[PDB]
Amino acid sequence: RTFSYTLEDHTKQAFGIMNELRLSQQLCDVTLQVKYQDAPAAQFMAHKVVLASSSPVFKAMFTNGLREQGMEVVSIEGIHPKVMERLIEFAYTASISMGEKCVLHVMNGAVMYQIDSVVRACADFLVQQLD
C-alpha cells in the first residue's frame, strides 16, 4: 500500500549543486562584506537559506519576517576574510581545511556564528597539540 523511498546521499548531491550555484553567483540573495583591520575588504555571495541552515546566528539574522527585495549587503567586522571563506565553504560542503596557525582564528569565527561542529573540531584538535 504505502510505498516509500529514501535516497541516502541526496543532501550531499544537492549541496554539491548549491555550492556550484554559489561559485557561479546564481540565485544568491546575500553579499557578505568582510573588513578586518589591515586586511583588504572581501565580498562573499551566498544564499541566506543555506547559511541559516548551518549557523543559528545567520538564521536569526535573516529571519525577520520580511521578504527583502533583491540583494542585501551584510557588513561583517571582527573576522578575517580568510576565516569567513572557510566557514562558508563548510556550510556548502560540510568540510573545512586550514593551517595549524589559523585554526584558532577559525574557532573564533565558528563560535561567533555558533557553528558547533566546527567549534568542537578545533577544540579537540588544539587539545591534541598540547604536551
Using the rule CB under 8 A, give the single segment among 32-40, 75-83, 116-124 that binds a second copy.
116-124
**Cβ neighbour number for residue 83 with a 10 Å cutoff:** 21
From 7, 23, 41, 130, residue interacting with a second copy (rule: CB under 8 A):
7
45: enclosing H helix or E strand: strand 39-46
Tell me the residue length of the chain: 131
Q: Does 10 contact a second copy by CB under 8 A?
A: yes
Based on CB atoms, which residue is closest to ligand D8N, 9 or 100?
100
One-letter amino acid at 1 equals R
The CA-based angle 28-34-37, given to 5 degrees, is 175
Per CB under 8 A, residues contacting a second copy are: 1-8, 10-18, 21, 26-29, 47-50, 52-54, 59, 62-63, 65, 67-71, 90-91, 94-100, 103, 117-118, 121, 125
